[PDB]
Design an enzyme around this catalytic site. Structure first.
Site, PDB file in Angstrom:
ATOM      1  N   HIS A  30      -3.587   6.080   3.283  1.00 25.00           N
ATOM      2  CA  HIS A  30      -4.281   4.854   2.892  1.00 25.00           C
ATOM      3  C   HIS A  30      -3.663   3.619   3.545  1.00 25.00           C
ATOM      4  O   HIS A  30      -4.360   2.806   4.158  1.00 25.00           O
ATOM      5  CB  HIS A  30      -4.249   4.730   1.378  1.00 25.00           C
ATOM      6  CG  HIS A  30      -5.419   3.984   0.831  1.00 25.00           C
ATOM      7  ND1 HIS A  30      -5.287   2.787   0.154  1.00 25.00           N
ATOM      8  CD2 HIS A  30      -6.743   4.243   0.890  1.00 25.00           C
ATOM      9  CE1 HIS A  30      -6.485   2.365  -0.210  1.00 25.00           C
ATOM     10  NE2 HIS A  30      -7.386   3.224   0.237  1.00 25.00           N
TER      11      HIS A  30
ATOM     12  N   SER B  49     -10.943  -1.376  -0.739  1.00 24.49           N
ATOM     13  CA  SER B  49      -9.635  -1.332  -0.117  1.00 24.49           C
ATOM     14  C   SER B  49      -9.765  -1.290   1.384  1.00 24.49           C
ATOM     15  O   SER B  49      -8.831  -1.682   2.084  1.00 24.49           O
ATOM     16  CB  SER B  49      -8.804  -0.146  -0.653  1.00 24.49           C
ATOM     17  OG  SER B  49      -9.544   1.062  -0.721  1.00 24.49           O
TER      18      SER B  49
ATOM     19  N   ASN C   2     -13.451  -0.462  -6.789  1.00 25.38           N
ATOM     20  CA  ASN C   2     -14.522   0.456  -6.397  1.00 25.38           C
ATOM     21  C   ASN C   2     -15.298   0.964  -7.599  1.00 25.38           C
ATOM     22  O   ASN C   2     -15.671   2.129  -7.669  1.00 25.38           O
ATOM     23  CB  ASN C   2     -13.950   1.633  -5.603  1.00 25.38           C
ATOM     24  CG  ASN C   2     -13.331   1.178  -4.257  1.00 25.38           C
ATOM     25  OD1 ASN C   2     -13.789   0.213  -3.671  1.00 25.38           O
ATOM     26  ND2 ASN C   2     -12.293   1.863  -3.788  1.00 25.38           N
TER      27      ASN C   2
ATOM     28  N   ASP D  46       0.817  -1.211   0.000  1.00 25.55           N
ATOM     29  CA  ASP D  46       0.000   0.000   0.000  1.00 25.55           C
ATOM     30  C   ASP D  46       0.855   1.268   0.000  1.00 25.55           C
ATOM     31  O   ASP D  46       1.940   1.283  -0.573  1.00 25.55           O
ATOM     32  CB  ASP D  46      -0.914  -0.042   1.234  1.00 25.55           C
ATOM     33  CG  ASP D  46      -2.186   0.704   1.041  1.00 25.55           C
ATOM     34  OD1 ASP D  46      -2.214   1.660   0.233  1.00 25.55           O
ATOM     35  OD2 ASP D  46      -3.160   0.357   1.744  1.00 25.55           O
TER      36      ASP D  46
ATOM     37  N   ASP E  83     -26.911 -12.551   4.080  1.00 23.78           N
ATOM     38  CA  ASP E  83     -27.301 -11.403   4.892  1.00 23.78           C
ATOM     39  C   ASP E  83     -27.210 -10.089   4.133  1.00 23.78           C
ATOM     40  O   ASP E  83     -27.758  -9.085   4.589  1.00 23.78           O
ATOM     41  CB  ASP E  83     -26.418 -11.322   6.143  1.00 23.78           C
ATOM     42  CG  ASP E  83     -26.583 -12.534   7.066  1.00 23.78           C
ATOM     43  OD1 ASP E  83     -27.609 -13.243   6.978  1.00 23.78           O
ATOM     44  OD2 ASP E  83     -25.689 -12.758   7.910  1.00 23.78           O
TER      45      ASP E  83
END
Length: 279
Positions: free
Chosen positions: A69, A224, A161, A39, A260
């Protein structure tokens, strides 16, 4: 053990139902495992890491997390307050620059580094890598994640994303690693979360509170952010002897909360990371 007033994601991964606030976990807490956070780095000095975090490699002028991040995701893996696996060892691998971007070549190098670097480390319970990053589909990026997994590391990667099928993203689309989608605190798929048959598991991804640089904290959303939940959970379950690197993804899938989540498109698993902890 119990963490009261835990962030919602930690509570969620120890509960069969949403909306609770206590994180229930076995006291072993991932002690003896290691998780490479691949990262922007990790501010190892953050008090929340209690000295359990260290930088081991950077691909840029500094090892400093100048973005946040990577500190955030390490915090979710293993910080005292925001972490799944509160005793794990964290190793930072800075493949993203401080703007949060990194060339494919650099991300591949970072994974090859972990494959090798783990042989210098004491991780009797096993080794996890948490990859909160991604880009377009790349066969070579995928292969790197596959090597890392083959080498004996439980690899967890973000689905991405894009609110799209993750088959078009890497390393999300590598079959052999654990690809992680995001859910929100109401057990909805996160509005941004990728989906698809390649997803193995969902974790809390929306509004995730964790460590930030400057010894601070913040809440961010993203697959992430879901990824380090699963990596910490793997490190936790590995320390507990319940699974291994090679099997942790499937084990987490098998033991997940099933059915769920809402807005899971047909063809995407409906499984939410769960530690099945019983006092």
């Amino acid at each position: 053990a119990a963490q009261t007033n835990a962030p919602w994601g930690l509570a969620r991964i120890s509960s069969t139902s949403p909306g609770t606030s206590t994180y229930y976990y076995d006291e072993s807490a991932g002690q003896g495992s290691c998780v490479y956070v691949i990262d922007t780095g990790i501010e190892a000095s953050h008090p929340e890491f209690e000295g359990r975090a260290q930088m081991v490699k950077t691909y840029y002028y500094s090892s400093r997390d100048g973005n946040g991040h990577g500190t955030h995701c390490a915090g979710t893996v293993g910080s005292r307050t925001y972490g799944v696996a509160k005793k794990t060892q964290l190793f930072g691998v800075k493949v993203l620059d401080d703007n949060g971007s990194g060339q494919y070549s650099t991300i591949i190098a970072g994974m090859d580094f972990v494959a090798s670097d783990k042989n210098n480390r004491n991780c009797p319970k096993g080794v996890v890598a948490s990859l909160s990053l991604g880009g377009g589909y790349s066969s070579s990026v995928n292969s790197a994640a596959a090597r890392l997994q083959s080498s004996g590391v439980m690899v967890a990667v973000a689905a991405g994303n894009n609110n799209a099928d993750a088959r078009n993203y890497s390393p999300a689309s590598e079959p052999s690693v654990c690809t992680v989608g995001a859910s929100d605190r109401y057990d909805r798929r996160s509005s941004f979360s990728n989906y698809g048959s390649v997803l193995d598991i969902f974790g809390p991804g929306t509004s995730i509170l964790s460590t930030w640089i400057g010894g601070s904290t913040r809440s961010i959303s993203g697959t992430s952010m879901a990824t380090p939940h699963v990596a910490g959970l793997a490190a936790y379950l590995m320390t507990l002897g319940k699974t291994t690197a090679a099997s942790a993804c499937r084990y987490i899938a098998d033991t997940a909360n099933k059915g769920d989540l809402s807005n899971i498109p047909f063809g995407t698993v409906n499984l939410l990371a769960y530690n099945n902890y019983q006092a």
